[PDB]
Amino acid sequence: IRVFAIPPSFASIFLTKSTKLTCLVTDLTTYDSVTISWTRQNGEAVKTHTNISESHPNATFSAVGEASICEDDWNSGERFTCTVTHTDLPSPLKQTISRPKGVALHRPDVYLLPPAREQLNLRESATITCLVTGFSPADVFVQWMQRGQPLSPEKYVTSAPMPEPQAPGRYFAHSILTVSEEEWNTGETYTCVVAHEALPNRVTERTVDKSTGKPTLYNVSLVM
Amino acid sequence: IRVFAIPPSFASIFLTKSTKLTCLVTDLTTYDSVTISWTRQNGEAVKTHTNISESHPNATFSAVGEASICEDDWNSGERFTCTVTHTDLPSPLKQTISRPKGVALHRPDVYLLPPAREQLNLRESATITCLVTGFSPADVFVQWMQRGQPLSPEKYVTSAPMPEPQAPGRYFAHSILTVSEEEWNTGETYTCVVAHEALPNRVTERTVDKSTGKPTLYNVSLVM
Amino acid sequence: IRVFAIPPSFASIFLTKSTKLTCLVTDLTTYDSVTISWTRQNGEAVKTHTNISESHPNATFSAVGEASICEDDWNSGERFTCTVTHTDLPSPLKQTISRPALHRPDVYLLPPAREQLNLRESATITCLVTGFSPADVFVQWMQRGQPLSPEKYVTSAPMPEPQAPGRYFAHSILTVSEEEWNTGETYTCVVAHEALPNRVTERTVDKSTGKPTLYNVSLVM
Ligand SMILES: *[C@@H]1O[C@H](CO)[C@@H](O)[C@H](O)[C@H]1NC(C)=O
Ligand SMILES: *[C@@H]1O[C@H](CO)[C@@H](O)[C@H](O)[C@H]1NC(C)=O
Ligand SMILES: *[C@@H]1O[C@H](CO)[C@@H](O)[C@H](O)[C@H]1NC(C)=O
């Protein structure tokens, strides 16, 4: 008898802008016509929690409860409660979840690092790493665009926010993208956008192409 | 007694992120006891309002109503209805606002333009000019940010979007920022963010500095 | 019960060089048998106003008065008056108009951004007209001497300048293909504004406005 609550984080909002919060019911015996509800602080009602899933063939419990909310009732501090009643535990169970205010917010420095000359001199495939350093709290959304056209998410891989070594309560994350290096010899655009809550407009874009940190070599200084 | 619907445009529900619909009435007698009621299509209860304007000099009056809603509720077009009831009206007066759907969407190709070499010869004050072209519908937002932090909202002037010459349904707007010749000749990178309802993260940005017209491989100088 | 005129602007003089006075009536309920009378300050007669107007489509009336007066009395302030004699009024009403600091624009053209000459399909040249007062410059665009069509450029209105107190700015964009602008193509923009001494300024940009003309560096393989 556990009831968990999976909330929507910044990666889940910003990918969709359609905040849906999920109440997970697990650890019972396999009974049908489950009774769950999603309620506010003031006891009202929401969208129905359709798309019930299958149960478990290892005989644990499976029920989800969704509700589509819009964002300001999730940030202002309204607690959202999933209520659970059934045949095993027919007593009213309350699982409350909200957004836990009381944490700082610093802005992510983003550096997009171009592929190293050891990697390119094989001429097989290059990987570009967007480094999203310095920020707090967690839950950043890193995604990649190839000149105003979002790349397929089978291609990049974002890390998880692991806490920074020398910085106190901050984080970092990474996101690598494997370009075929034949596409990097034309060297098009490759911008990395990073959606955090502490930015001014909440979206930062950095870009790197084949000639970005290249210094000037041929300093011709003719004098007369 | 004329009524005016001022629906929040995309500029207004982007720069505050606090969608806030308002409606006004002019040509009204200078008497107290205003009621301006907002409602939905189904008829729930909305936020109240205060801060009613003072008298007109021409023995007339104007009253104002402010509320707050959700953004998906705008994009769903629940035509919110504001009704005037007073001790000087003969009849109920009303307006129904919505989202005017039935429109295309198009991407603003921002281009940031660095000042004319004629103007960095007089040596007082440049004018950097973000050109925001190609979009549809109207109502783009442009904001200038120098080194993360935003510049003062009266050091730059966005125009109003005007229909582009050959392409029919598209528009263009401009925005100019004035710097002096000492701020430009250090470089400062001067970002120009463009907020528009057809961009994937709804915020794009460009940047220029005085080393952008350079060819940055050769530094061909010339001394005397 | 009002009458508003359409006085000549600088764009109304300079585009046509056939300056004219026009005035329309409003808030008057619809009727017929109206007379509008264009009349000078000292009362002498004018060009005979013709081309009678129609009713308003909002249950009211409009009426038009035409005239063609040359520039010396308009630039000095002949307070031109268009009298309405209606049926709503047995009191005929005289509505006068007039032509009421002077700085000069600094036209700078700006050649298209190098981000735009990678698409190779459109380029936008942008005649920035900053500094002037009063409003309503007339900007137009001449290509190789012969003036370009009025459907290949736009121009905003004046909009008051950010830091300057009572001075304006304007803009005008002219769209060319990349094959046009990458083959020479002088593209003069000419501002027409009264506080200029000659009353016209014109400036030019081709592709080669910036290479420094002593040296000429190339990058060969
Ligand atoms: C490039 O040449 C200029 C021309 O005199 C010289 O002053 C400068 O030191 C050189 N820069 C570098 C990085 O070598
Ligand atoms: C580039 O050339 C300028 C021109 O004098 C010179 O002052 C500067 O030091 C040079 N810089 C580099 C990085 O080559
Ligand atoms: C320099 O001049 C030569 C001949 O006039 C020409 O071939 C070359 O293209 C010029 N340089 C550039 C960058 O166009």
Question: Tell me, what DSSP letter sits at residue A76?
Answer: T
Q: Which residue type is seen at B213?
A: G
Q: How far is A70 from chain B, CA to nearest CA, in Å?
A: 7
Q: What is the C-alpha separation between C65 and C78, in angstroms, rounded?
A: 17
Only one residue has tokens 């057809």, namely: B198
Q: Hey, is the C-beta of C173 within 8 angstroms of any chain B C-beta?
A: yes
| Superfamily holding B102-224 | Immunoglobulins (2.60.40.10)
Q: Hey, is the C-beta of B204 within 8 angstroms of any chain C C-beta?
A: no
With contact defined as beta carbons under 8 Å apart, do A145 and A204 qualify? Answer: no
Q: What is the C-alpha separation between A157 and A192, in angstroms, rounded?
A: 12
Deposited resolution, Å = 3.4
Q: What is the C-alpha separation between B84 and A198, in angstroms, rounded?
A: 41
Residues of A in contact with B209 (CB under 8 A): none
Q: Hey, is the C-beta of B181 within 8 angstroms of any chain A C-beta?
A: no
Quick check: C175 and B165 CB within 8 A? yes
Q: Report domain extents, chain A.
A: 1-101, 102-224
Quick check: A221 and B224 CB within 8 A? no
Computed over its alpha carbons, how large is the radius of gyration of chain A?
24
Closest atom of ligand 2 to B223 CA is: 5
Mutating to test ligand 1, I would choose from A214, A217, A219, A221 the residue with most ligand atoms within 8 A of its C-beta, which is: A219
**Entry field: residues in chain C:** 221
Q: Name subunits touching A (3+ CB pairs < 8 A).
A: B
Q: Which residue of B has its CA nearest to C117?
A: B111
Q: Is C218 in the pocket of ligand 3 (CB under 6 A)?
A: yes
CA distance readout (Å), C155 to B114, B125, C138, C140: 20, 23, 9, 9
Experimental approach: cryo-EM
Computed over its alpha carbons, how large is the radius of gyration of chain B?
23
Quick check: B127 and C126 CB within 8 A? no
Write out the H or E segment, with its range, that includes residue B145. Answer: strand B141-145
Identify the CATH number of the domain defined by range C101-221.
2.60.40.10
Q: How far is C163 from chain B, CA to nearest CA, in Å?
A: 7
Q: Which residue of A has its CA nearest to B206?
A: A205
- For C97-146, the DSSP string reads E-----B--EEE--PPPTTTTTT-S-EEEE-EEES-BSS--EEEEEETTE
Q: Whose CA is nearest to atom 3 of ligand 3?
A: C216
With contact defined as beta carbons under 8 Å apart, do B162 and B134 qualify? Answer: no
Q: What is the C-alpha separation between B97 and B65, in angstroms, rounded?
A: 14
With contact defined as beta carbons under 8 Å apart, do C80 and C36 qualify? Answer: no
Q: 3-class DSSP state for residue A39?
A: strand
Produce one character per residue of C166-192: b if its CB has 16 or more CB atoms within 10 Å, e if not: ebbbbbbbbbbebeebeeeeebbbbbb
Q: How far is A87 from chain B, CA to nearest CA, in Å?
A: 37
Which residues contact ligand 1 via a Cβ below 6 A? A 219, 221; B 219, 221
Q: 3-class DSSP state for residue B40?
A: coil
Q: 3-class DSSP state for residue B4?
A: strand
Residues of B in contact with C152 (CB under 8 A): 165-166
Q: Are strands A2-6 and C123-126 parallel, antiparallel or unpaired?
A: unpaired
Cross-chain CB nearest to A223 (options B217, B219, B223): B223
Quick check: B200 and A224 CB within 8 A? no
Per CATH, B1-101 and B102-224 having the same topology is answered yes
Alpha helices of A147-198 — where are they, by DSSP H?
181-186
Q: How many CB pairs under 8 A join A and B?
A: 61
Only one residue has tokens 């209105």, namely: C157
Only one residue has tokens 């535990």, namely: A89
Q: Hey, is the C-beta of A200 within 8 angstroms of any chain B C-beta?
A: yes
Which of A199, A201, A207 is the mutation pick for testing B, counting most B CBs within 10 A? A201
Q: How far is B36 from chain A, CA to nearest CA, in Å?
A: 25
| Superfamily holding C1-100 | Immunoglobulins (2.60.40.10)
Residues of B in contact with C161 (CB under 8 A): 157, 178
Instruction: Look up the CATH architecture of domain B1-101.
Output: Sandwich (2.60)
Q: How far is B135 from chain C, CA to nearest CA, in Å?
A: 15
With contact defined as beta carbons under 8 Å apart, do C141 and C172 qualify? Answer: yes
Cross-chain CB nearest to B220 (options C106, C113, C217): C217
- For chain C, the DSSP string reads -EEEEE---HHHHHHHS---EEEEEESEEP-SS-EEEEE-SS----S---S---B-TTSEE--EEEE---HHHHHHT--EEEEEE-SS-SS-EEEEE-----B--EEE--PPPTTTTTT-S-EEEE-EEES-BSS--EEEEEETTEEPPTTSEEE------SSSSS--EE-EEEEE-HHHHTS----EEEEE-TTSSSS-EEEE--S-SSS-SS-------
Q: Which residue of B has its CA nearest to A76?
A: B18
Q: Hey, is the C-beta of C113 within 8 angstroms of any chain B C-beta?
A: yes
Write out the H or E segment, with its range, that includes residue A15. Answer: helix A10-16
